Amino acid sequence: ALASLGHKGIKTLRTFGRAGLMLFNALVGKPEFRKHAPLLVRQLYNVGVLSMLIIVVSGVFIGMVLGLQGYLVLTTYSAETSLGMLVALSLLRELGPVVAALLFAGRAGSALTAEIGLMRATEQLSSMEMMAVDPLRRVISPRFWAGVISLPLLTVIFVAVGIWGGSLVGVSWKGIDSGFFWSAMQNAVDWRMDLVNCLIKSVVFAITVTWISLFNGYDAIPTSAGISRATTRTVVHSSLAVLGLDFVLTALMFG
Amino acid sequence: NALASLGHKGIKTLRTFGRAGLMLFNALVGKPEFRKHAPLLVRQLYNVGVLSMLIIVVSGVFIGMVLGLQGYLVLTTYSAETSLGMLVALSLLRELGPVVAALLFAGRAGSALTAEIGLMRATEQLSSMEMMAVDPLRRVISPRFWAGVISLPLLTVIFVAVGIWGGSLVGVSWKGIDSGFFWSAMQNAVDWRMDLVNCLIKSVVFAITVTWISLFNGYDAIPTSAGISRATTRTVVHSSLAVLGLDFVLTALMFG
Amino acid sequence: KKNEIWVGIFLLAALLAALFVCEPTYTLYATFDNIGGLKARSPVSIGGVVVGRVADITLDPKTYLPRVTLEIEQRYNHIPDTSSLSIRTSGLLGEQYLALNVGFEDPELGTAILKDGDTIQDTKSAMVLEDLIGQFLY
Amino acid sequence: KKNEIWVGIFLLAALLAALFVCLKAANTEPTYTLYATFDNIGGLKARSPVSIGGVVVGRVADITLDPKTYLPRVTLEIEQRYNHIPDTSSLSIRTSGLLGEQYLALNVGFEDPELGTAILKDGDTIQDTKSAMVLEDLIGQFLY
Amino acid sequence: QTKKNEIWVGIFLLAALLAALFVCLKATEPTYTLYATFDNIGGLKARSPVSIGGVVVGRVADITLDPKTYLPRVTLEIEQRYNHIPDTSSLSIRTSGLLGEQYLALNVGFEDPELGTAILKDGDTIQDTKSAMVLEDLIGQFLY
Amino acid sequence: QTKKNEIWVGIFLLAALLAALFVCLKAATEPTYTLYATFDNIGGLKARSPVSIGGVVVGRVADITLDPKTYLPRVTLEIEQRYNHIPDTSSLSIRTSGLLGEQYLALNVGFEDPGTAILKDGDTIQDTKSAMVLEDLIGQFLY
Amino acid sequence: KKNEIWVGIFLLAALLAALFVCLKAATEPTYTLYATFDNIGGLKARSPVSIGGVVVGRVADITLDPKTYLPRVTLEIEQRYNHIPDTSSLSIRTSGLLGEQYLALNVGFEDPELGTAILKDGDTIQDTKSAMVLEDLIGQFLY
């Protein structure tokens, strides 16, 4: 057991070292953002805009499911007018950021890894190094900043759409009074601190997810089979990291 | 521009649905279906089930812990903290268990199947199997489909039974609730046959849908190495959307 | 090329059918004075057994008395016109529902059966905790 | 592209029909405003409904005080479909739920075709009101 | 390799079985049905427990009206271990705690195989019952 | 194939902004002047709790602290300047919103006299009323 | 590979120590008693047995005497509480609102001239008081 366990331990430590080195070498730089706008805009399109339909269509459904499962519980205690509070808080605290991060790792967290692994397979990174163009500054950092900028926005869209789906189920379908719903929801729970905590954990999830994605796409074996073993590894490790960091951040920000 | 583009996309989606239906149909009609297929199905249960078990266990632990925290904080304002076990168990057996298990299974094992079949199609292994008179749909699609269908409900059961333990860790061991009240309140009051059977039903539906979408996208991908990596993402996306939609439908049907 | 379109259309049709499928109700009318917390699709019940929903609630625009229209399943026909409706809360805090009371019929006296379209005369509005507390404390 | 465009237009029409069928599940309106002055509006807030015997007929626009007398003055918008409301009708705040969510209740005073009960037209004012009973002093009165 | 895959699939199936057992142990015997008619079943449902002095001694199969007189008729299923319930036993609907679900309470009547009263066997009907308590008529009876 | 990306990123940013505005508008200074009052039982009052006259929020609660000499909870509160002419016969009362909602200060103004001065910044309300606790309430109902 | 094996042993020891620290950051000789109630209410197995709010044992099982149909609970008091006089009386009490009930062992004082039979493994506590039911309280208060 110990014959291979220590080798695996030193291998995992070396993997963490390579990841940290990639991040540090790709982030340090003063001329970073300017002259890179035509890169960052394209990356915001690839990472952000293309990953918007899934976010919206999933937010609608999660809002509807929350509305149903909250109505069927609150109608027992005559508190069905607090369904707005329930939906909004369950989205702004746990479901919103975590589910947005999972779907981002699925759609845009695996696309980045696949794209960078394929760019490494056709030897575009080596060809970019051969003409004195540092790839870590030319191909990594635009994607990293696109992911970091684009996940906390998809999270806001996911929330503001799930709230509307819960409104569809509660107010329209079930028949709750809209005034009670909205007024009950806004004064009681939507404080500045809940939105700030949502955005904070969303930004942390963005950082970790896009870092894992870029690293697994940059450290993959160039063969067409090592890429697919890196996309699945990206999805798995990113889901695990999202859930663990979510538990930690909940324990921090909610007592 | 919209009329032509919308019509073309509609026709293409109809064609894709038809091809998926034909693939599944021709893959699920046979006499030797399960005999002489034991090693195939065992290896596929290992590649789909066993390898996708650590992620399920860890995610179950963490989601049980998050549920314990966010349920204790809600119930402590009404002194109903002893109903935390009921809350965690029901929230897992109704929505979080099956849906999250399906999402993680489509990420880990739903993309691995698509990538593996796309690669098997790229190296001309499927054509080389057809050329020696071995129907690949009956040889590589059926074992993987049955492995997925058999392996998702078991993963969901493990996910639940682990998240319940995580919620117990948070509520009983950390927050200090009486263990007797927790378990007894949870067991006696709400975990009847109907809550479970519904969990298994929606888990089996999610299994069918996820594994079918994954196998079809792996079997219909463009053989190039850029058509595989574009089919894995499509697998994950379509599978997550289908899981969430079917989950909303099944909730509306089975509960309200 | 065409067989695939045909099987796709058939698959979509079968999936929508299984999505949908996976009553000869007749309609009455009741004019309360305070429906309390009744809504559409709220259950009508006889002794606690659901015997149909409540269609919708619309104010009588000429006298401003909420008229409730309900749909009772066909299995229950012999409901005497001397029946009575009431609004009760399920349990202690649960949702409100219509508690239909089957008033007994006299043997030598005419007691019409509630046909489709007839209205129930005797009703009992919901209770307002404000007025009950006022009556109890004064 | 003829049959393709036809199929696309048919799919758009089918999506519109599906949206209309979903609208068969459930779902502005002219409104005229009134005014009232309660001694204690309780937990009433803006958008709280105004119901005539459990049927919503309008919402509360906003709540302000009379800065000279410090009496909360509620202004409410009643939907136009309910025209003939006699001025003898009296408002009353009633509790709904458990967390304090309240809602007006318009007791329509029955008409009087022997005096000429003035219809509450736009901008009118409702005289008779009833403040929301607070549980604290009520429990005190019951105990004392 | 096949040995490793086989033992691991076995361990996976075993862990799934242990998980199902954990769930079902933190969540199938001879029975015999009896009938009972009320006039207000309150909020009973399928599989609502029937308890003798606080111990579950069966469930409820279905609740249907009496299509001739419109009275509910519950069909409980008492476990076979208890076969000495006299005919004097009276049913009564209660609720667990204050907000819990409603369950049937089975007061064992004073047995007396001296005056002829028999023991409830399969197919019999409990004659003496007691309907559930409604809040509306409760408050009405209280403050009147 | 680049103005497409530009306009789509613009639309995405605009949608994110509209969503943020929707949330922040379904989520929710002014010259005040603080007052002081020392209850005997603040119940469940807390910082940033609403004060109200007749049910209309006229100011928050600054903070709560004990009088380190007499051990009585002296709560200080801010009031919007628009509500100036508040007589000194006023009497703060602590009430709970509904039956399970949060607690709030229910300020009621009193009548005046043709000595009833007007409350100003820094003044201390004399008449108060502590919050009703459940156990002694039940005890008095029974005894 | 020996140095790698040693490094792995060190990592495993560190992981086990971290697991012990996590367990630290998060049995007793019970002796069985017996008691029979008229109606135990919603009391379930494993529900605690408290002596003035301090748990001193669980409830092992609840069964009916198949000849008189009276429920017979069997509880397990911990060893550290030995001097429990026989005059002590059980009483089922509710905690909360959904029926989470729990025994409340009320210790009774001994006798200053004959003592009292101290409860022992296998005894039976005679003075029992059945669980309160709401329907009968209402049917008593209204009549």
Place this chain on the structure above:
Amino acid sequence: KKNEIWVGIFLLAALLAALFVCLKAANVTEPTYTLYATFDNIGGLKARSPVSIGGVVVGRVADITLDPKTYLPRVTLEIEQRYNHIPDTSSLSIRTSGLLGEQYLALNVGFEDPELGTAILKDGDTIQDTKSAMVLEDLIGQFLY
């Protein structure tokens, strides 16, 4: 190779240190002079249940034990030593925060006798007058009986 391993060890150390300071800021300001009090029925008290003087928290409850010779549940609390002048007459009572909230100790400060002493309850001392928590069962019983 060596530099990669060193960067990995440093990054993992920084990550675990951040997570450790976080979890130390998560699970859990120390004058905390403790008192002792014996009750007859602590009701629903626990550890970490707040003590309060007139409504504001002034300390928490360390733990609850049973006096093994009389079986009177003896509770121990910790008062922040910002507050000293608490006479021995100061009573203790168990009240429920609101109608349904958690239970908490109410420290009704006794009248400091200015002409008789009534010394200050210092660290380690105990309170004499208490009031056990009410239980609704026998209260309702005795009420309607």
